[PDB]
Amino acid sequence: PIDILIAGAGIGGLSCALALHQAGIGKVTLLESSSEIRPLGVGINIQPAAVEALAELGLGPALAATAIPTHELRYIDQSGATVWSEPRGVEAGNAYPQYSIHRGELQMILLAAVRERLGQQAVRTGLGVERIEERDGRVLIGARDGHGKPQALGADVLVGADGIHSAVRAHLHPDQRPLSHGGITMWRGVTEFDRFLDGKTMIVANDEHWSRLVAYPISARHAAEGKSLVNWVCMVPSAAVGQLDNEADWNRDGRLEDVLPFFADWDLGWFDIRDLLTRNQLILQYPMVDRDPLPHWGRGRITLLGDAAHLMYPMGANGASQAILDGIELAAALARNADVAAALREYEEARRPTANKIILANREREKEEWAAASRPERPRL
Numbered sequence: 001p002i003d004i005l006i007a008g009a010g011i012g013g014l015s016c017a018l019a020l021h022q023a024g025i026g027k028v029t030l031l032e033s034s035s036e037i038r039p040l041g042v043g044i045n046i047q048p049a050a051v052e053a054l055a056e057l058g059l060g061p062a063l064a065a066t067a068i069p070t071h072e073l074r075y076i077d078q079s080g081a082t083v084w085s086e087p088r089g090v091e092a093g094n095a096y097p098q099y100s101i102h103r104g105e106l107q108m109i110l111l112a113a114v115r116e117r118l119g120q121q122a123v124r125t126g127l128g129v130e131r132i133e134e135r136d137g138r139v140l141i142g143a144r145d146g147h148g149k150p151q152a153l154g155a156d157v158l159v160g161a162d163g164i165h166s167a168v169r170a171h172l173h174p175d176q177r178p179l180s181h182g183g184i185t186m187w188r189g190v191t192e193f194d195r196f197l198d199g200k201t202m203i204v205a206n207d208e209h210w211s212r213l214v215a216y217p218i219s220a221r222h223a224a225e226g227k228s229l230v231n232w233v234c235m236v237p238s239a240a241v242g243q244l245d246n247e248a249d250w251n252r253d254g255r256l257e258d259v260l261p262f263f264a265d266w267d268l269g270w271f272d273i274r275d276l277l278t279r280n281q282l283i284l285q286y287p288m289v290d291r292d293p294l295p296h297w298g299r300g301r302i303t304l305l306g307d308a309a310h311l312m313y314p315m316g317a318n319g320a321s322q323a324i325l326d327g328i329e330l331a332a333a334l335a336r337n338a339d340v341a342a343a344l345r346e347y348e349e350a351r352r353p354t355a356n357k358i359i360l361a362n363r364e365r366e367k368e369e370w371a372a373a374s375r376p377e378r379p380r381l
Protein backbone atom coordinates (compact mmCIF):
# COMPACT_ATOMS: atom_id res chain seq x y z
CA PRO A 1 0.00 0.00 0.00
CA ILE A 2 1.03 3.59 -0.71
CA ASP A 3 2.26 5.66 2.22
CA ILE A 4 -0.03 8.61 2.93
CA LEU A 5 0.94 11.46 5.23
CA ILE A 6 -1.67 13.95 6.41
CA ALA A 7 -0.43 17.23 7.88
CA GLY A 8 -2.80 18.24 10.65
CA ALA A 9 -4.94 16.13 12.98
CA GLY A 10 -7.92 18.46 13.11
CA ILE A 11 -11.47 17.68 12.00
CA GLY A 12 -10.42 17.36 8.37
CA GLY A 13 -7.26 15.35 8.90
CA LEU A 14 -8.82 12.80 11.23
CA SER A 15 -11.98 12.40 9.18
CA CYS A 16 -9.82 12.03 6.07
CA ALA A 17 -7.77 9.27 7.70
CA LEU A 18 -11.02 7.44 8.48
CA ALA A 19 -12.28 7.84 4.90
CA LEU A 20 -9.01 6.47 3.50
CA HIS A 21 -9.17 3.51 5.88
CA GLN A 22 -12.79 2.91 4.85
CA ALA A 23 -11.68 2.79 1.21
CA GLY A 24 -8.88 0.41 2.18
CA ILE A 25 -6.35 2.91 0.88
CA GLY A 26 -2.71 2.91 1.99
CA LYS A 27 -0.92 3.15 5.30
CA VAL A 28 -1.91 6.45 6.89
CA THR A 29 0.12 8.60 9.29
CA LEU A 30 -0.85 12.01 10.65
CA LEU A 31 1.50 14.77 11.85
CA GLU A 32 0.01 17.23 14.35
CA SER A 33 1.89 20.37 15.43
CA SER A 34 0.15 20.56 18.82
CA SER A 35 1.86 18.68 21.66
CA GLU A 36 -1.44 17.01 22.51
CA ILE A 37 -4.84 16.80 20.80
CA ARG A 38 -7.35 18.54 23.09
CA PRO A 39 -11.14 19.00 22.88
CA LEU A 40 -10.77 22.70 22.06
CA GLY A 41 -13.25 25.06 20.43
CA VAL A 42 -16.97 25.61 20.94
CA GLY A 43 -20.08 24.59 19.01
CA ILE A 44 -20.21 23.90 15.28
CA ASN A 45 -22.87 22.54 12.92
CA ILE A 46 -22.45 19.38 10.84
CA GLN A 47 -24.88 19.39 7.88
CA PRO A 48 -26.96 16.25 7.14
CA ALA A 49 -24.76 15.29 4.16
CA ALA A 50 -21.66 15.42 6.36
CA VAL A 51 -23.52 13.59 9.14
CA GLU A 52 -24.39 10.87 6.60
CA ALA A 53 -20.69 10.49 5.75
CA LEU A 54 -19.79 10.15 9.43
CA ALA A 55 -22.61 7.64 9.95
CA GLU A 56 -21.35 5.50 7.06
CA LEU A 57 -17.98 5.70 8.83
CA GLY A 58 -19.66 4.06 11.85
CA LEU A 59 -19.87 7.16 14.05
CA GLY A 60 -23.66 7.44 14.19
CA PRO A 61 -23.96 6.20 17.82
CA ALA A 62 -21.07 8.38 19.01
CA LEU A 63 -22.64 11.49 17.50
CA ALA A 64 -26.09 10.74 18.94
CA ALA A 65 -24.47 10.35 22.36
CA THR A 66 -23.03 13.88 22.40
CA ALA A 67 -24.58 16.16 19.78
CA ILE A 68 -28.01 17.77 19.44
CA PRO A 69 -30.20 16.91 16.42
CA THR A 70 -31.28 20.50 15.74
CA HIS A 71 -34.75 20.45 14.18
CA GLU A 72 -35.60 24.13 13.74
CA LEU A 73 -34.13 27.59 13.13
CA ARG A 74 -36.09 30.63 14.33
CA TYR A 75 -35.26 34.17 13.25
CA ILE A 76 -36.58 36.54 15.91
CA ASP A 77 -36.95 40.32 15.79
CA GLN A 78 -35.87 42.86 18.38
CA SER A 79 -39.11 42.41 20.32
CA GLY A 80 -38.34 38.69 20.58
CA ALA A 81 -41.11 37.56 18.22
CA THR A 82 -40.51 34.86 15.63
CA VAL A 83 -40.28 36.47 12.19
CA TRP A 84 -39.29 33.38 10.22
CA SER A 85 -38.76 29.73 11.03
CA GLU A 86 -37.76 26.63 9.12
CA PRO A 87 -37.16 22.98 9.93
CA ARG A 88 -33.67 21.48 10.02
CA GLY A 89 -32.40 17.91 9.91
CA VAL A 90 -34.74 14.97 9.37
CA GLU A 91 -37.88 17.07 9.80
CA ALA A 92 -36.67 19.27 6.94
CA GLY A 93 -36.67 16.23 4.67
CA ASN A 94 -33.09 15.09 5.18
CA ALA A 95 -32.27 11.40 5.54
CA TYR A 96 -29.95 12.22 8.45
CA PRO A 97 -30.06 14.84 11.21
CA GLN A 98 -28.10 18.07 11.32
CA TYR A 99 -25.90 17.81 14.41
CA SER A 100 -24.95 20.78 16.57
CA ILE A 101 -21.88 19.58 18.42
CA HIS A 102 -18.96 20.82 20.51
CA ARG A 103 -16.03 20.86 18.06
CA GLY A 104 -13.82 19.36 20.77
CA GLU A 105 -16.17 16.45 21.37
CA LEU A 106 -16.20 15.84 17.62
CA GLN A 107 -12.40 15.83 17.48
CA MET A 108 -12.23 13.30 20.33
CA ILE A 109 -14.75 11.03 18.59
CA LEU A 110 -12.72 11.15 15.38
CA LEU A 111 -9.43 10.72 17.25
CA ALA A 112 -10.79 7.70 19.13
CA ALA A 113 -11.90 6.06 15.87
CA VAL A 114 -8.53 6.74 14.21
CA ARG A 115 -6.54 5.23 17.08
CA GLU A 116 -8.92 2.25 17.15
CA ARG A 117 -8.84 1.47 13.43
CA LEU A 118 -5.41 2.76 12.43
CA GLY A 119 -3.47 2.13 15.60
CA GLN A 120 -2.12 4.30 18.38
CA GLN A 121 1.06 5.02 16.38
CA ALA A 122 -0.85 6.57 13.50
CA VAL A 123 -1.09 10.08 15.02
CA ARG A 124 2.20 11.80 15.71
CA THR A 125 1.67 14.87 17.89
CA GLY A 126 4.18 17.59 18.66
CA LEU A 127 5.46 17.53 15.07
CA GLY A 128 4.89 20.48 12.77
CA VAL A 129 5.47 20.36 9.02
CA GLU A 130 8.05 22.98 8.08
CA ARG A 131 9.54 21.99 4.72
CA ILE A 132 8.25 20.01 1.74
CA GLU A 133 9.90 18.65 -1.41
CA GLU A 134 8.65 16.32 -4.10
CA ARG A 135 11.69 14.26 -5.00
CA ASP A 136 12.57 10.70 -6.03
CA GLY A 137 8.99 9.75 -6.82
CA ARG A 138 7.84 10.66 -3.31
CA VAL A 139 7.10 13.66 -1.12
CA LEU A 140 9.81 14.38 1.43
CA ILE A 141 8.66 16.22 4.53
CA GLY A 142 10.77 18.12 7.04
CA ALA A 143 9.10 18.50 10.43
CA ARG A 144 10.24 19.82 13.80
CA ASP A 145 9.23 18.86 17.34
CA GLY A 146 8.68 20.96 20.45
CA HIS A 147 12.37 20.73 21.33
CA GLY A 148 13.33 22.09 17.92
CA LYS A 149 14.63 18.70 16.77
CA PRO A 150 14.24 17.89 13.03
CA GLN A 151 12.16 14.95 11.78
CA ALA A 152 12.35 13.67 8.22
CA LEU A 153 9.46 11.72 6.71
CA GLY A 154 8.50 10.44 3.27
CA ALA A 155 5.23 9.49 1.62
CA ASP A 156 3.63 8.67 -1.72
CA VAL A 157 0.91 11.21 -0.97
CA LEU A 158 0.89 14.34 1.19
CA VAL A 159 -2.49 15.68 2.27
CA GLY A 160 -2.41 19.22 3.57
CA ALA A 161 -5.14 19.30 6.20
CA ASP A 162 -3.25 21.83 8.30
CA GLY A 163 -5.96 24.49 8.63
CA ILE A 164 -6.05 28.27 8.62
CA HIS A 165 -2.25 28.70 8.77
CA SER A 166 -1.47 25.73 6.52
CA ALA A 167 2.22 25.17 5.84
CA VAL A 168 1.37 22.87 2.95
CA ARG A 169 -0.78 25.56 1.29
CA ALA A 170 1.97 28.18 1.71
CA HIS A 171 4.42 25.77 0.06
CA LEU A 172 2.13 25.23 -2.94
CA HIS A 173 1.04 28.87 -3.27
CA PRO A 174 4.01 30.94 -1.97
CA ASP A 175 2.78 34.14 -3.63
CA GLN A 176 -0.70 33.89 -2.16
CA ARG A 177 -2.64 36.71 -0.53
CA PRO A 178 -2.47 36.99 3.26
CA LEU A 179 -5.76 36.05 4.98
CA SER A 180 -8.69 38.19 3.78
CA HIS A 181 -10.69 39.97 6.48
CA GLY A 182 -14.42 39.55 5.97
CA GLY A 183 -15.16 42.81 7.75
CA ILE A 184 -16.84 41.11 10.70
CA THR A 185 -15.56 40.56 14.25
CA MET A 186 -16.70 37.41 16.04
CA TRP A 187 -17.11 36.50 19.71
CA ARG A 188 -18.37 33.05 20.64
CA GLY A 189 -18.72 30.82 23.66
CA VAL A 190 -21.06 28.56 25.57
CA THR A 191 -23.42 29.27 28.46
CA GLU A 192 -25.34 26.76 30.54
CA PHE A 193 -29.12 27.06 30.50
CA ASP A 194 -31.64 25.43 32.82
CA ARG A 195 -33.85 25.40 29.73
CA PHE A 196 -33.68 26.77 26.18
CA LEU A 197 -36.82 26.25 24.13
CA ASP A 198 -37.07 22.52 23.40
CA GLY A 199 -33.32 21.99 23.69
CA LYS A 200 -32.92 21.51 19.95
CA THR A 201 -33.85 24.81 18.33
CA MET A 202 -31.47 27.38 16.85
CA ILE A 203 -32.15 31.08 17.36
CA VAL A 204 -30.97 33.89 15.04
CA ALA A 205 -31.31 37.66 15.48
CA ASN A 206 -29.86 40.97 14.31
CA ASP A 207 -30.47 44.67 14.87
CA GLU A 208 -30.59 47.66 12.54
CA HIS A 209 -26.86 48.19 13.21
CA TRP A 210 -26.13 44.75 11.72
CA SER A 211 -24.98 43.23 15.01
CA ARG A 212 -25.92 39.53 14.81
CA LEU A 213 -26.61 36.75 17.30
CA VAL A 214 -26.83 33.00 16.67
CA ALA A 215 -27.52 30.62 19.56
CA TYR A 216 -28.10 26.87 19.68
CA PRO A 217 -27.79 23.87 22.08
CA ILE A 218 -24.87 21.50 21.48
CA SER A 219 -24.75 19.03 24.38
CA ALA A 220 -26.70 15.77 24.46
CA ARG A 221 -25.31 15.11 27.96
CA HIS A 222 -26.82 18.35 29.25
CA ALA A 223 -30.09 17.55 27.48
CA ALA A 224 -30.15 14.19 29.27
CA GLU A 225 -31.05 16.24 32.35
CA GLY A 226 -33.46 18.64 30.72
CA LYS A 227 -30.73 21.27 30.70
CA SER A 228 -28.88 22.80 27.75
CA LEU A 229 -25.39 23.98 26.82
CA VAL A 230 -26.12 26.93 24.57
CA ASN A 231 -23.47 27.79 22.00
CA TRP A 232 -23.59 31.41 20.94
CA VAL A 233 -21.95 33.64 18.36
CA CYS A 234 -22.06 37.42 18.20
CA MET A 235 -21.05 39.06 14.92
CA VAL A 236 -20.34 42.79 14.68
CA PRO A 237 -18.92 44.90 11.82
CA SER A 238 -15.16 45.11 12.37
CA ALA A 239 -15.35 48.80 11.46
CA ALA A 240 -17.02 49.31 14.85
CA VAL A 241 -14.39 47.36 16.78
CA GLY A 242 -10.96 48.29 15.50
CA GLN A 243 -8.20 45.67 15.51
CA LEU A 244 -8.69 42.76 17.90
CA ASP A 245 -5.31 41.09 17.39
CA ASN A 246 -2.31 40.80 15.09
CA GLU A 247 -3.29 37.36 13.78
CA ALA A 248 -6.39 35.14 13.60
CA ASP A 249 -6.42 32.45 16.33
CA TRP A 250 -9.09 29.76 16.87
CA ASN A 251 -8.39 29.66 20.63
CA ARG A 252 -8.01 33.34 21.55
CA ASP A 253 -9.85 34.49 24.67
CA GLY A 254 -12.20 37.43 24.31
CA ARG A 255 -13.59 40.02 26.72
CA LEU A 256 -17.21 40.53 27.77
CA GLU A 257 -16.59 44.28 27.83
CA ASP A 258 -15.68 44.26 24.13
CA VAL A 259 -18.83 42.50 22.92
CA LEU A 260 -21.56 43.39 25.45
CA PRO A 261 -21.76 47.10 24.46
CA PHE A 262 -23.09 46.12 21.03
CA PHE A 263 -25.97 44.17 22.56
CA ALA A 264 -26.45 46.29 25.70
CA ASP A 265 -29.57 47.95 24.28
CA TRP A 266 -31.13 44.65 23.20
CA ASP A 267 -34.21 43.36 25.01
CA LEU A 268 -35.70 40.30 23.36
CA GLY A 269 -38.06 39.81 26.29
CA TRP A 270 -38.34 36.05 26.80
CA PHE A 271 -34.67 35.63 25.83
CA ASP A 272 -32.15 37.54 27.98
CA ILE A 273 -29.05 38.33 25.90
CA ARG A 274 -27.30 40.07 28.80
CA ASP A 275 -27.71 36.82 30.76
CA LEU A 276 -26.45 34.74 27.83
CA LEU A 277 -23.23 36.74 27.58
CA THR A 278 -22.63 37.53 31.25
CA ARG A 279 -22.91 33.90 32.42
CA ASN A 280 -20.64 32.49 29.69
CA GLN A 281 -18.35 29.56 30.53
CA LEU A 282 -15.88 31.18 28.11
CA ILE A 283 -15.63 33.85 25.40
CA LEU A 284 -13.38 33.50 22.35
CA GLN A 285 -12.59 36.26 19.82
CA TYR A 286 -11.88 35.78 16.12
CA PRO A 287 -11.79 38.02 13.03
CA MET A 288 -14.08 36.60 10.33
CA VAL A 289 -11.43 35.66 7.76
CA ASP A 290 -11.26 33.53 4.61
CA ARG A 291 -8.92 33.15 1.64
CA ASP A 292 -9.29 34.08 -2.03
CA PRO A 293 -10.44 31.21 -4.30
CA LEU A 294 -7.50 29.38 -5.92
CA PRO A 295 -7.25 28.33 -9.60
CA HIS A 296 -5.86 24.96 -8.49
CA TRP A 297 -5.19 23.19 -5.19
CA GLY A 298 -2.49 20.57 -5.57
CA ARG A 299 0.67 19.81 -7.50
CA GLY A 300 2.07 16.36 -8.17
CA ARG A 301 1.62 14.11 -5.14
CA ILE A 302 0.49 16.93 -2.83
CA THR A 303 -3.08 18.12 -2.23
CA LEU A 304 -5.09 20.22 0.24
CA LEU A 305 -8.22 19.53 2.29
CA GLY A 306 -10.48 21.45 4.67
CA ASP A 307 -9.45 24.95 5.71
CA ALA A 308 -6.00 24.51 4.15
CA ALA A 309 -7.79 24.23 0.82
CA HIS A 310 -10.75 26.56 1.26
CA LEU A 311 -10.88 28.51 4.53
CA MET A 312 -14.38 30.03 4.94
CA TYR A 313 -16.25 32.26 7.39
CA PRO A 314 -17.41 30.08 10.31
CA MET A 315 -21.15 30.05 9.58
CA GLY A 316 -23.81 27.83 8.03
CA ALA A 317 -22.42 24.64 6.51
CA ASN A 318 -18.92 26.06 6.06
CA GLY A 319 -15.94 24.46 7.76
CA ALA A 320 -16.26 21.03 9.34
CA SER A 321 -19.02 19.84 6.99
CA GLN A 322 -16.96 20.73 3.92
CA ALA A 323 -13.75 19.20 5.30
CA ILE A 324 -15.59 15.96 6.04
CA LEU A 325 -17.00 15.75 2.50
CA ASP A 326 -13.55 16.58 1.04
CA GLY A 327 -12.19 13.50 2.81
CA ILE A 328 -14.82 11.19 1.35
CA GLU A 329 -14.15 12.48 -2.17
CA LEU A 330 -10.37 12.24 -1.79
CA ALA A 331 -10.61 8.62 -0.66
CA ALA A 332 -12.97 7.83 -3.54
CA ALA A 333 -10.63 9.48 -6.06
CA LEU A 334 -7.63 7.51 -4.80
CA ALA A 335 -9.69 4.30 -4.94
CA ARG A 336 -10.82 5.01 -8.52
CA ASN A 337 -7.48 6.00 -10.07
CA ALA A 338 -4.25 4.02 -10.42
CA ASP A 339 -2.03 7.10 -10.71
CA VAL A 340 -1.64 9.15 -7.51
CA ALA A 341 -1.27 12.52 -9.24
CA ALA A 342 -4.34 11.95 -11.43
CA ALA A 343 -6.35 10.86 -8.38
CA LEU A 344 -5.47 14.06 -6.55
CA ARG A 345 -6.38 16.23 -9.53
CA GLU A 346 -9.75 14.48 -9.91
CA TYR A 347 -10.49 14.97 -6.21
CA GLU A 348 -9.57 18.66 -6.45
CA GLU A 349 -11.64 19.42 -9.53
CA ALA A 350 -14.61 17.73 -7.90
CA ARG A 351 -14.37 19.84 -4.73
CA ARG A 352 -12.63 23.12 -5.66
CA PRO A 353 -15.33 24.58 -7.96
CA THR A 354 -17.88 23.96 -5.21
CA ALA A 355 -15.74 25.56 -2.51
CA ASN A 356 -14.95 28.60 -4.67
CA LYS A 357 -18.64 29.20 -5.38
CA ILE A 358 -19.43 29.19 -1.65
CA ILE A 359 -16.56 31.58 -0.87
CA LEU A 360 -17.55 34.10 -3.55
CA ALA A 361 -21.25 33.92 -2.64
CA ASN A 362 -20.58 34.31 1.09
CA ARG A 363 -18.49 37.40 0.39
CA GLU A 364 -21.18 38.94 -1.80
CA ARG A 365 -23.92 38.41 0.79
CA GLU A 366 -21.80 39.95 3.57
CA LYS A 367 -20.90 42.89 1.32
CA GLU A 368 -24.55 43.49 0.40
CA GLU A 369 -25.66 43.43 4.04
CA TRP A 370 -22.94 45.89 5.05
CA ALA A 371 -23.89 48.25 2.22
CA ALA A 372 -27.59 48.09 3.10
CA ALA A 373 -26.98 48.60 6.81
CA SER A 374 -24.75 51.60 6.08
CA ARG A 375 -27.44 53.88 4.68
CA PRO A 376 -29.69 56.04 6.92
CA GLU A 377 -35.18 46.21 14.27
CA ARG A 378 -34.18 49.01 16.63
CA PRO A 379 -32.85 47.67 19.96
CA ARG A 380 -35.75 48.38 22.33
CA LEU A 381 -33.53 50.06 24.94
Ligand SMILES: Cc1cc2nc3c(=O)[nH]c(=O)nc-3n(C[C@H](O)[C@H](O)[C@H](O)COP(=O)(O)OP(=O)(O)OC[C@H]3O[C@@H](n4cnc5c(N)ncnc54)[C@H](O)[C@@H]3O)c2cc1C
Nearest residue numbers: 008010011012033041042128129162163167306307314320
Ligand atom coordinates in the same frame (compact mmCIF):
# COMPACT_ATOMS: atom_id res chain seq x y z
C1 LIG B 1 -8.04 24.62 18.63
C2 LIG B 1 -9.06 24.86 17.55
C3 LIG B 1 -10.31 25.34 17.92
C4 LIG B 1 -11.28 25.56 16.95
N1 LIG B 1 -12.52 26.05 17.33
C5 LIG B 1 -13.50 26.29 16.39
C6 LIG B 1 -14.75 26.78 16.76
O1 LIG B 1 -15.01 27.01 17.94
N2 LIG B 1 -15.71 27.01 15.80
C7 LIG B 1 -15.44 26.76 14.47
O2 LIG B 1 -16.29 26.97 13.61
N3 LIG B 1 -14.21 26.27 14.09
C8 LIG B 1 -13.23 26.04 15.04
N4 LIG B 1 -12.00 25.54 14.64
C9 LIG B 1 -11.74 25.31 13.17
C10 LIG B 1 -12.52 24.11 12.63
O3 LIG B 1 -12.07 22.92 13.25
C11 LIG B 1 -12.34 24.03 11.12
O4 LIG B 1 -12.71 25.26 10.52
C12 LIG B 1 -13.11 22.89 10.40
O5 LIG B 1 -13.58 21.90 11.32
C13 LIG B 1 -12.24 22.17 9.32
O6 LIG B 1 -11.20 21.48 9.99
P1 LIG B 1 -9.69 21.48 9.44
O7 LIG B 1 -9.04 20.16 9.75
O8 LIG B 1 -9.59 21.87 7.97
O9 LIG B 1 -8.99 22.66 10.32
P2 LIG B 1 -8.56 22.57 11.87
O10 LIG B 1 -9.65 21.94 12.69
O11 LIG B 1 -8.18 23.99 12.24
O12 LIG B 1 -7.27 21.60 11.95
C14 LIG B 1 -5.99 21.97 11.47
C15 LIG B 1 -4.99 21.12 12.28
O13 LIG B 1 -3.74 21.24 11.63
C16 LIG B 1 -2.71 21.56 12.59
N5 LIG B 1 -1.58 22.28 11.94
C17 LIG B 1 -1.51 23.58 11.52
N6 LIG B 1 -0.28 23.78 10.99
C18 LIG B 1 0.42 22.62 11.06
C19 LIG B 1 1.71 22.26 10.66
N7 LIG B 1 2.49 23.13 10.03
N8 LIG B 1 2.15 20.98 10.87
C20 LIG B 1 1.33 20.04 11.47
N9 LIG B 1 0.04 20.39 11.85
C21 LIG B 1 -0.39 21.66 11.65
C22 LIG B 1 -3.43 22.24 13.82
O14 LIG B 1 -2.76 22.23 14.96
C23 LIG B 1 -4.86 21.65 13.71
O15 LIG B 1 -4.94 20.59 14.63
C24 LIG B 1 -11.01 25.31 15.59
C25 LIG B 1 -9.75 24.82 15.22
C26 LIG B 1 -8.78 24.59 16.20
C27 LIG B 1 -7.44 24.07 15.77
